[PDB]
């Protein structure tokens, strides 16, 4: 299940933009892995280790991190495959954070336009 996190508006924002991400109701004391992934194909989305951050939720089960918005970058498929340079300005991207098990708060649906 995805927790409740408040992220800033990153839809229609070009490089340099900063998208805030605050989790609320997530595993307390649990680690999360945030990153900017762009959908390349059906069920196939690339990830960019250039905008991958990290953070840990406090006892309150709330975390706070900043996600860098990129216009485009190497779409690193979670599977560990090189999809290709994705164009966030061509499709809708989203940020998120994964822990050891690979869990995180309600995915972050974003876009560029």
Write the layout of secondary structure elements.
Blueprint lengths: L3 E4 L10 E7 L6 E11 L2 E13 L5 E7 L3 E6 L3 E7 L5 E4 L11 E2 L4
Antiparallel strand pairs: 1-2, 2-5, 3-4, 3-8, 6-7, 8-9
PDB class: antibiotic
Keywords: beta sandwich, IGG fold, antibiotic
Assembly: monomeric
Describe the protein's architecture and organization.
This protein is an all-beta fold and 113 residues long. It has one domain: Immunoglobulin-like. 0% of the residues lie in helices and 54% in strands. The protein contains no helices and nine strands. It has a four-stranded antiparallel sheet with strand order 4-3-8-9, with no helix packed on it. Strand 6 (72-77) and strand 7 form a beta hairpin. Keywords: Antibiotic, Antimicrobial, Disulfide bond, DNA-binding, Signal.
What's the short story on this structure?
Belongs to the neocarzinostatin family. Keywords: Antibiotic, Antimicrobial, Disulfide bond, DNA-binding, Signal. With 113 residues, this protein is mainly beta.
Task: Give descriptors for this structure.
monomer, mainly beta, 113 residues, antibiotic, signal, Immunoglobulin-like, 3-stranded antiparallel beta sheet, Neocarzinostatin, globular, disulfide bond, DNA-binding
At the fourth level of CATH, the homologous superfamily is: Neocarzinostatin-like
Encode the helix/strand succession as letters. Answer: EEEEEEEEE
Put simply, the count of helices is: 0
Q: What global shape is seen?
A: globular
The largest sheet has its strands arranged as 4-3-8-9
- Total strands: the figure is 9
Number of domains: 1
Q: Determine the strand fraction and express it as a percent band.
A: over 45%
According to CATH, what is the class? Mainly Beta
- The helix/strand class is mainly beta
How would a textbook summarize the main sheet? Answer: 4 strands, antiparallel
Taking the alpha carbons of the first and last residues, their distance comes to 29 Å
Provide the helix percentage: under 10%
The CATH architecture category equals Sandwich
Predict the CATH topology. Answer: Immunoglobulin-like
Radius of gyration: 13 Å
Family: Belongs to the neocarzinostatin family.
GO molecular function: DNA binding
Keywords: Antibiotic, Antimicrobial, Disulfide bond, DNA-binding, Signal
Disulfide bonds: 37-47, 88-93
């Amino acid at each position: 299940a995805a927790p409740t996190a408040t992220v800033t508006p990153s839809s229609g924002l070009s490089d340099g933009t900063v998208v805030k991400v605050a989790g609320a109701g997530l595993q307390a004391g649990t680690a999360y892995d945030v990153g900017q992934c762009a959908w390349v194909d059906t069920g196939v989305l690339a990830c960019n280790p250039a905008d991958f951050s990290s953070v840990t939720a406090d006892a309150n089960g709330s975390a706070s991190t900043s996600l860098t918005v990129r216009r485009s970058f190497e779409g690193f498929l979670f599977d560990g495959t090189r999809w290709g340079t994705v164009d966030c300005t061509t499709a809708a991207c989203q940020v998120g954070l994964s822990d050891a098990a690979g869990n995180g708060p309600e995915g972050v649906a974003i876009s560029f336009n």
